[PDB]
Structures are given as structure tokens and as C-alpha cells.
Amino acid sequence: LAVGKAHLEALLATRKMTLEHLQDVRHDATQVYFDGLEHLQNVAQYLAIPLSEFFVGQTQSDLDDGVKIARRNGGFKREEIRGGVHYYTYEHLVTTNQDPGLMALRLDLHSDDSREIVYVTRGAVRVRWVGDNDELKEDVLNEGDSIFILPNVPHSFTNHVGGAKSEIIAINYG
Amino acid sequence: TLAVGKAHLEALLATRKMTLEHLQDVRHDATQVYFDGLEHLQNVAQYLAIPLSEFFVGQTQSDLDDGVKIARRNGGFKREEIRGGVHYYTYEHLVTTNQDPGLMALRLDLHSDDEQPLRLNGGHGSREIVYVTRGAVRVRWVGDNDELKEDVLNEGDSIFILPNVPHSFTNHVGGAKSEIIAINYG
Amino acid sequence: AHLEALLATRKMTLEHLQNVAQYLAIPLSEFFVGQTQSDLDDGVKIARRNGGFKREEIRGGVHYYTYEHLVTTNQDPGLMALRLDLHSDDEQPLRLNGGHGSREIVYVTRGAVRVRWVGDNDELKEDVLNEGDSIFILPNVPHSFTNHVGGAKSEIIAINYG
Amino acid sequence: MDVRTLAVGKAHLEALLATRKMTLEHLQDVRHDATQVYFDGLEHLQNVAQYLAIPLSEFFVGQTQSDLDDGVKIARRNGGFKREEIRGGVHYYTYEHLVTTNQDPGLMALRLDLHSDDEQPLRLNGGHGSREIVYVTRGAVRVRWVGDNDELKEDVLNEGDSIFILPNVPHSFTNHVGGAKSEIIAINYG
Numbered sequence: 001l002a003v004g005k006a007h008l009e010a011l012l013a014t015r016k017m018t019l020e021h022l023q024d025v026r027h028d029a030t031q032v033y034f035d036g037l038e039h040l041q042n043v044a045q046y047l048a049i050p051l052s053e054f055f056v057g058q059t060q061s062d063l064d065d066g067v068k069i070a071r072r073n074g075g076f077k078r079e080e081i082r083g084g085v086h087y088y089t090y091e092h093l094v095t096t097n098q099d100p101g102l103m104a105l106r107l108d109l110h111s112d113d114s115r116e117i118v119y120v121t122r123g124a125v126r127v128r129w130v131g132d133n134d135e136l137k138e139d140v141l142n143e144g145d146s147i148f149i150l151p152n153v154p155h156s157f158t159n160h161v162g163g164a165k166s167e168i169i170a171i172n173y174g
Numbered sequence: 175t176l177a178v179g180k181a182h183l184e185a186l187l188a189t190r191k192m193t194l195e196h197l198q199d200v201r202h203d204a205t206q207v208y209f210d211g212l213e214h215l216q217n218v219a220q221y222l223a224i225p226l227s228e229f230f231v232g233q234t235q236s237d238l239d240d241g242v243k244i245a246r247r248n249g250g251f252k253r254e255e256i257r258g259g260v261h262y263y264t265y266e267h268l269v270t271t272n273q274d275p276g277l278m279a280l281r282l283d284l285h286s287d288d289e290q291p292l293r294l295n296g297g298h299g300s301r302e303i304v305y306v307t308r309g310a311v312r313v314r315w316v317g318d319n320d321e322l323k324e325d326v327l328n329e330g331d332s333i334f335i336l337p338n339v340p341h342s343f344t345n346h347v348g349g350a351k352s353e354i355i356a357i358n359y360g
Numbered sequence: 361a362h363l364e365a366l367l368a369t370r371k372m373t374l375e376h377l378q379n380v381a382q383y384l385a386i387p388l389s390e391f392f393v394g395q396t397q398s399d400l401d402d403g404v405k406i407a408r409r410n411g412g413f414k415r416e417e418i419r420g421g422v423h424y425y426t427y428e429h430l431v432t433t434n435q436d437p438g439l440m441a442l443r444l445d446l447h448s449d450d451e452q453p454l455r456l457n458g459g460h461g462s463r464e465i466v467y468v469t470r471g472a473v474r475v476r477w478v479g480d481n482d483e484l485k486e487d488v489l490n491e492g493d494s495i496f497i498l499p500n501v502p503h504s505f506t507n508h509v510g511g512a513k514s515e516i517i518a519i520n521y522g
Numbered sequence: 523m524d525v526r527t528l529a530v531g532k533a534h535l536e537a538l539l540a541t542r543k544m545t546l547e548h549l550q551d552v553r554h555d556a557t558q559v560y561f562d563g564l565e566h567l568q569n570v571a572q573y574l575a576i577p578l579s580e581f582f583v584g585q586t587q588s589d590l591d592d593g594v595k596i597a598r599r600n601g602g603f604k605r606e607e608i609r610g611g612v613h614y615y616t617y618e619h620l621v622t623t624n625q626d627p628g629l630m631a632l633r634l635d636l637h638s639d640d641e642q643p644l645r646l647n648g649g650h651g652s653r654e655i656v657y658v659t660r661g662a663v664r665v666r667w668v669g670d671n672d673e674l675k676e677d678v679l680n681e682g683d684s685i686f687i688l689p690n691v692p693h694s695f696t697n698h699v700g701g702a703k704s705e706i707i708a709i710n711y712g
């Protein structure tokens with residue numbers, strides 16, 4: 001395995017160490033080499049550092065000058081059909097490796113059966129969620145309406161009336 | 175008179191291995207502790223080695239009903255943005271909550287185009303994601319090399335913007351008014 | 361200055377207006393973030409022995425702890441450093457705390473310390489820490505520090521943080 | 523053992539895929555058992571990471587087994603890492619690790635011996651990102667630090683005294699007397 005040397009000796013700095021205190025690890029020119037993940041994990045144990053930290057910032061950014069652009073129907077797109085019933089049409093919006101917590105989706109609602117924000121781009125949307133004391137709460141969101149949802153709140157979005165196809169923008173973040 | 179949550183103030187004192195008995199000149203009921211002016215509250219802040227803000231952290235009542243906040247179209251704040259004498263945006267707040275003050279969701283009407291001069295913002299510390307709902311949108315942002323970058327987003331396209339990146343959204347076609355959804359978050 | 365920065369996040373200015381906090385959908389605490397002046401002397405705060413808060417802890421009529429604040433700063437209200445004198449041993453009954461939301465690390469500066477805590481399955485776990493030994497404790501873990509020998513008063517440093 | 527293979531927690535990976543409305547089937551070239559998903563080298567894992575628009579570090583987040591025993595970790599004197607510190611041909615510190623846990627890698631607790639004094643030239647550090655608090659357990663400690671606008675400030679800390687240090691503030695601890703060797707406790711965190 002290959003690890004960014006400048007980053008590794010930055011991690012070693014937090015433990016008041018250098019490349020010296022690593023047992024037989026080949027290195028030269030801003031690169032440190034481990035023979036196997038089990039080897040790196042043993043180094044991870046020794047430094048009392050989780051394995052994930054050794055890759056932090058090692059992935060090349062997918063941004064173009066601090067910006068990433070996605071196109072309609074450009075990324076992942078899927079249909080959700082369970083039991084012959086057409087429910088959703090999933091589509092990824094712009095996703096970046098600079099914020100894995102960010103998940104943006106465009107949803108075409110067809111059927112009548114992390115923090116999150118949801119905006120209704122078209123049609124009437126029927127929203128359910130479990131309030132406190134396990135009370136079944138429901139409401140109808142129309143075009144222009146938006147909703148904020150606290151983490152760990154059971155909720156579902158569907159088409160209000162049926163026949164008419166609705167569309168929402170769902171953003172999950174941190 | 176200044177009020178501070180009793181349970182929260184006791185929790186603060188608990189960490190410092192203190193109780194309300196270790197605070198002087200303080201009135202209190204079951205829910206709150208009372209101070210004689212902010213000058214009194216400043217002395218106590220000094221005594222506990224604590225910023226004045228900590229007395230009110232988590233003491234704001236939630237605006238969710240419940241765990242959920244719903245906004246209606248044109249239900250919130252709304253204004254026009256004029257930069258350098260140029261009509262640029264038409265801000266409309268989406269749903270806002272005090273459970274996440276770092277979240278700013280907006281619907282914008284673009285009014286400027288290529289026949290108007292460029293008016294970049296200073297950017298913001300908020301991560302931003304923008305979705306185009308209508309029309310064609312010209313986006314310009316300042317790259318790493320201090321140089322200007324540009325692109326065009328059509329209906330359905332989206333863009334992610336790193337914090338503190340100066341940017342501008344205008345109409346690709348002069349005259350035609352486009353619409354976007356701008357979501358700022360932590 | 362700070363208010364105009366808070367208003368800027370809502371795309372507002374001073375002439376668009378503590379019910380204000382409710383209207384701006386902003387917690388009351390955020391309007392004070394940064395108002396208190398730093399107590400640091402050029403990025404540093406120094407505290408002397410027996411200078412700050414000092415208290416004796418007597419639980420159930422038995423002398424257990426002697427709390428003494430180390431350096432405290434308004435630049436980190438989550439930091440709580442204490443020097444403790446241990447006065448109780450195992451001939452006096454065991455009295456655990458309720459734990460706390462802060463991560464904690466303790467260092468034995470003198471003597472021998474008997475540490476008890478509630479681990480898995482609500483089981484009472486025990487061990488002994490000598491001078492130079494240390495212990496990390498997860499948040500909300502009920503624990504207790506007493507003398508191992510008894511009479512031989514020990515001393516520890518306990519740091520609480522984020 | 524196969525050194526080329528990279529193992530990833532199956533439940534964790536599936537959780538990541540679930541957020542992006544995906545299942546394991548949308549990844550073709552992967553073997554897996556009940557507990558883990560296997561990749562043919564780091565080259566393969568980087569392809570899947572880019573496709574998922576997910577940084578390489580996220581595949582291992584929360585997957586490290588805890589070194590705690592019953593929510594507690596105990597260290598002994600001379601039981602862990604121990605190192606000498608010479609900065610400019612000048613013997614300065616003797617680093618000794620206190621208890622270190624992977625449940626808080628930002629927590630670096632040290633017991634230090636002071637070897638330098640007024641006879642030796644000053645050797646400040648460049649400061650660090652971690653907040654720090656120091657407690658004097660023995661001797662008299664001379665502390666120097668770079669204040670605001672690059673002014674040199676000094677003070678003396680005796681047994682029982684403490685000091686808080688803001689992140690990225692250059693500092694140095696030496697023996698006040700000169701000859702007598704002092705001891706301190708340094709706690710770096712978040």
C-alpha cells in the first residue's frame with residue numbers, strides 16, 4: 001500500500017514520533033510503502049490511530065477550482081419498482097468526495113403508497129412522519145413548499161392524489 | 175433582569191465541581207436563575223472562566239413540530255438583491271429552523287445577464303449546493319489561480335461550491351428569467 | 361459587527377428589523393458568541409497552586425476528595441482540569457459518581473490509587489494505579505478514586521475535555 | 523495471507539451504498555462473505571471510491587476495533603512509547619506517552635523531563651493545532667512563548683502551577699534554576 005509521506009509524518013507528529021520509530025518501512029520521495037493492509041493496521045494499532053486517518057486527504061479532489069458540476073441524467077439513476085408498483089425514480093445530483101455526508105437526490109414520485117431538507121419542485125407531495133408518543137403525523141406539500149427533518153425521524157414521501165406525477169429535491173447533509 | 179436555565183447552569187457548575195450555593199447574589203425558581211443586570215452576569219462569567227454565550231447554549235426553544243418544520247411557498251422572508259446598481263437576485267427563504275442555524279435554503283430569481291457587469295460575492299464559509307429548476311444559468315467563480323472560471327447550468331443540472339469561493343449566478347440568455355434553489359449548510 | 365454577520369447568513373441587513381432570535385431562526389446563544397473578551401495573556405493563561413477554586417468533598421460523612429481547579433479559560437469552557445487529594449480507602453464504603461459527558465484522563469502524581477468503574481453489563485470493575493500510571497475514561501462512565509493503602513494519601517491529576 | 527486484498531466492513535459499505543440508493547449488486551467485481559467486502563488491490567478500491575464519489579478514508583470510518591476495556595484504558599509507567607528530544611544539538615525533552623487510545627487520537631498525553639536551561643540557546647517550537655494544558659509535578663519551570671505580534675514572553679511555573687496554551691502558539695519549557703531537572707505533564711486534545 002502507498003501512503004502520503006507528508007501526511008503520515010504529520011500523523012506521527014501528533015504522537016511525537018517520526019518515520020524513525022516505524023519498524024522497517026520502505027520510503028522515499030513523499031511516499032511510504034506498506035506490504036499489506038494488515039501491516040498498516042499493525043502500525044495503526046501502535047500509533048493508537050484508527051486506520052481511516054491514514055487515508056485522510058490522500059484521495060484526489062474531484063472539484064474543478066473548488067467547484068463540482070453534475071448534469072441532469074448524468075450520474076446514477078434508478079427506478080424503484082416493488083411488486084409491480086412504480087414508486088420512485090431516483091437520480092443523483094452533484095456528489096463530491098469533499099463531503100461524503102452530502103447526499104442530493106431528485107425524486108419522481110409515482111405511486112400512492114443526517115439532517116435532511118426537501119423542496120417540492122412540482123405537484124403535490126404527501127409526507128408522513130412519526131412524532132413523539134409515536135403519533136402518526138401527515139401533511140401535504142405543494143410546489144414551492146419545503147420541509148426540514150431532524151435526524152432519526154421516520155418519514156416517507158409519496159404522491160398525494162395519484163395520476164399526477166410529483167417531483168422533489170432531497171438533500172441530506174452532516 | 176436576566177434569566178438563565180437553572181438545569182443548564184447547574185450542569186455548568188457541576189463540571190466545575192460547584193453548586194448554586196457557590197454562586198452569590200442569585201435569585202432562582204424551578205426553571206431559571208436570575209441575575210441583576212448583565213454586569214452581574216459578566217462577573218459570574220469571569221468567576222466560572224466561561225464565555226457569556228455558554229449561559230444560553232441549548233436554552234432556545236425548538237421550532238419543530240415535531241422533529242419537523244414545514245414552510246409554504248412565499249411564506250417566508252423575501253427581498254431583492256441589487257449589486258452595484260444592478261438587479262441580480264430575488265431572495266426567498268425556504269424552511270429555516272433554530273435547530274440548524276447553519277442551514278440557509280433559498281429560491282432565487284436571476285435578473286442579470288451578460289449585458290450587465292459582473293458582480294461577484296465575497297463568498298461564505300458555508301458549503302453550498304445549487305439546483306436549477308428553470309431556465310439556463312451562467313455560473314462564474316474564482317478559481318485557485320485567482321482567475322475567473324465559467325460554465326452554464328441548464329434545468330436539472332446542479333453544482334457544489336466549496337466554502338469561501340466567490341461566485342455569481344446570472345441568466346445565460348438575456349431577458350429570460352431563470353430560477354435556482356440554493357442550499358447553504360454547515 | 362457580529363449581528364451584521366448573523367444577519368448576513370439570513371441574507372438580511374440591520375434595517376430589516378430577544379424575539380428577534382425567534383424571527384431570525386437563530387438560537388439566543390449565537391448572538392453572544394465572541395462578545396466575552398479573551399482571558400488569555402497573549403494566547404496563554406497561567407494559574408498558580410492554591411490560587412483558584414478549592415473545595416473538600418465529603419460524601420456520606422466521609423472525607424473523599426480535595427478538589428482544586430487548575431488553569432481554566434473562557435477560550436475552552438469544555439476544559440476542566442483538577443488536582444485531587446484522595447483521603448478515603450476501602451475500609452470506608454464505595455461511592456461512585458454518576459459519570460459525566462466529558463472524556464476524561466487521569467494521571468497519578470503520588471501514592472497508589474484504587475480505581476473502580478462500571479463497565480460492561482453494569483459490572484463493577486476494579487484496578488490499581490501507581491505513580492506514573494494513567495487512565496482514559498469514556499464519557500458517562502461512573503467511577504471512583506480512593507487510596508489503595510489507606511492513610512497513605514495519594515494525589516491525581518484529572519483532565520476533562522470536549 | 524494475501525497482502526494485495528483490502529477488506530472493508532460489509533455492513534459499513536452497505537450503509538454507504540444505501541445513502542446513495544445503491545446495493546452491493548451495483549458493484550460487479552467484488553467478492554464478499556458475511557462480514558466483509560474484498561477488493562483486488564488499492565487500485566480497485568480507488569475506482570469504486572471515485573464512482574461513489576467517496577473519499578478513500580470513508581471506507582474505514584468507525585471500523586477500527588476499540589482498544590478500550592469496559593469503557594476504560596489503563597497505561598503503566600515505562601509501559602509505552604518513550605523518546606528523547608534534541609532540537610539544536612541541545613537536549614530538551616524526554617517524551618513519555620501516557621495512556622493513548624484510538625477512541626480519541628486527538629488526545630496526546632505526555633510526561634516530560636526537562637533537560638535544558640539558561641546555559642543553552644532557546645529552542646521554541648512552531649506551535650501546534652491541538653489545545654494544550656501543562657501541569658508542573660516537580661521543580662521550577664521556565665516557560666517562554668511567542669505572544670501577539672511576535673513578542674517574546676517569559677514566566678516561571680513552580681510545582682502545582684499550570685498553564686493553558688492556545689493552538690499554534692509557539693512555546694518552550696526549560697529548567698528555571700539550571701542543573702536541577704524538572705518534570706511536567708502535557709495534555710494535548712481536540
Ligand SMILES: C[C@@H](O)CP(=O)(O)O
Nearest residue numbers: 442444457466505518
Ligand atoms: C475527578 C474525577 O475523576 C472523579 P469525580 O469528581 O467525577 O467523582
Ligand SMILES: C[C@@H](O)CP(=O)(O)O
Nearest residue numbers: 634647656693695708
Ligand atoms: C510540553 C510540550 O509543550 C512540549 P512540545 O509540545 O512543544 O513538544
Ligand SMILES: [Fe+3]
Nearest residue numbers: 295298302356
Ligand atoms: Fe450566494
Ligand SMILES: [Fe+3]
Nearest residue numbers: 457460464518
Ligand atoms: Fe470525573
Ligand SMILES: [Fe+3]
Nearest residue numbers: 650654693708
Ligand atoms: Fe506543546
